[PDB]
Amino acid sequence: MEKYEGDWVNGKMHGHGKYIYSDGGVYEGDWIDGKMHGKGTYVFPNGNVYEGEWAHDMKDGYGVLTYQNGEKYEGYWKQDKVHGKGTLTYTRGDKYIGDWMDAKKDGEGELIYANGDRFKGQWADDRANGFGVFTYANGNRYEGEWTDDKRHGRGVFYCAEDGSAYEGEFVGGRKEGNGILRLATGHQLEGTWSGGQLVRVTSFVFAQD
Amino acid sequence: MEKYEGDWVNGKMHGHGKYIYSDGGVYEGDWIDGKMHGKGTYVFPNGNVYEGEWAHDMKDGYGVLTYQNGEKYEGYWKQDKVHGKGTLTYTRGDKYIGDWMDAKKDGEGELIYANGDRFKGQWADDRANGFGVFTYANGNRYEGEWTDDKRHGRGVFYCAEDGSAYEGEFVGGRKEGNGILRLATGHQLEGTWSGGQLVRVTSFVFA
């Protein structure tokens, strides 16, 4: 059995009001035309809680959704979906700050991982797409083009293990086709890579300069 | 206008004797059966001078030939040809010490260059053939097989310029075919070289 305690206008809930839904979990805050509208808080049966701005019975504008588990989103909503600027903390400790579209990461975004890794760059369909920089915990670093959370196209990868930066084509997160490899010495290699293994050397200069 | 002044036996020059030849240039020393034989010296018209051992009218045994120019050979002769152990100084300043055959370098020999370079190894037909070590003035060094004064077959070459060492096949004084290349880092490369350019990579590692 559902129930309400608040302000009535015309024949509908309007103004401040607290509402208990048939399923466990309540709402307290602002109402317009019998819909949740304005600043209010919802406590869900599943233990999740939203407090922030509503419009036409949905989360719209700035709001904070904290989950039963660590997960917490602080940012903007449009029609009950995460939309625009937003910061999401994952249970893991990983954090995304940046641009959301239709409950997916889309645009400029920085994801700082709990393992010390961090990526900043362009996102599309909730995955890295376009330019970006991944800096690995170990000291390895990528800078260049991404396709579907994979290093794809022209990129520069540095390997902390042996120095030796690579400049060239990437395919499916591995270096493929023409490229250049500088080692810490000043030794450079030009040629072709096949699935991350060097096949052919075009040039083999030194020129430390 | 020939002439002689020395010892006669039977009907020929025999014992000590000095001889002036038709062309300018003389001989003074030992004679047998009217031939230069034993210890004696010849001063040639061309300005060359030999002093050493003779047999049957030719240089045979140990002798010293000093030339019109700086060139000087100290070693063994057989029938007027440089033969066996010998040391030759060139006008250049270069020195060869070692084994000669029929007036050509043949066997074990060390050539010390005036530019600081040095080769030691096996010679044939007056050129490096078989094993040997060339050490370059700059610090570069080769050790392995030679064919006709060229690095040919299995060899190890070190390049002082980039402190890298290569182990593999050489063809015509350049690295060709399968080989391994270690760099100063610890990075090693396996694969095939063509002329002196890497074509194909088998392995690539860091140590």
Numbering used by the authors:
A (entry chain AAA): 147 to 355
B (entry chain BBB): 147 to 353
Provide passages from the article that reported this PDB entry.
High-resolution crystal structures and biophysical analyses of a truncated form of the TbMORN1 protein and its homologues from the parasites Toxoplasma gondii (TgMORN1) and Plasmodium falciparum (PfMORN1) enabled, for the first time, a structure-based definition of the MORN repeat. All three structures are antiparallel dimers joined via their C-termini, and, when possessed of the correct key residues, can adopt extended or V-shaped quaternary structures. The crystal structures confirmed that each 23-amino acid MORN repeat is composed of a β-hairpin followed by a 6-residue loop that connects to the next MORN repeat. The structural studies presented here make a case that one conserved function of MORN repeats is in homotypic interactions and possibly also in higher-order assembly.
The structures of TgMORN1(7–15) and both P21 and C2 crystal forms of TbMORN1(7–15) were subsequently determined to 2.90, 2.35 and 2.53 Å resolution, respectively, with the PfMORN1(7–15) structure used as a search model for the molecular replacement. The two subunits in the TbMORN1(7–15) C2 crystal form and the TgMORN1(7–15) dimer make a rather straight assembly, while in the P21 form they display a bend of about 30°, leading to a rod-shaped particle appearance. TbMORN1(7–15) formed an extended antiparallel dimer in both crystal lattices, while TgMORN1(7–15) adopted this architecture in one crystal form. In comparison to the TbMORN1(7–15) C2 crystal form, the extended TgMORN1(7–15) structure has an approximately 1.5-times smaller dimer interface (601 Å2), which is contributed by residues from MORN repeats 13–15 only. This is closer in size to the 747 Å2 interface of the P21 crystal form of TbMORN1(7–15). The final C-terminal part of the protein seems to be flexible and does not engage in the stabilisation of the dimer. In comparison to TbMORN1(7–15), the dimer interface of TgMORN1(7–15) is not built around aromatic stacking but instead employs hydrophobic interactions between Phe350 and neighbouring small hydrophobic residues, such as Leu335 and Leu327. In contrast to TbMORN1(7–15), where the dimerisation interface is centred around aromatic stacking, a hydrophobic core plays a crucial role in the dimer interface of extended TgMORN1(7–15). The dimer is stabilised by a single salt bridge formed between the Asp308 of one subunit and the His333 of the other subunit. SAXS analysis of TbMORN1(7–15) and TgMORN1(7–15) indicated an extended dimer in solution and the crystal structures could be docked into the calculated molecular envelopes without difficulty.
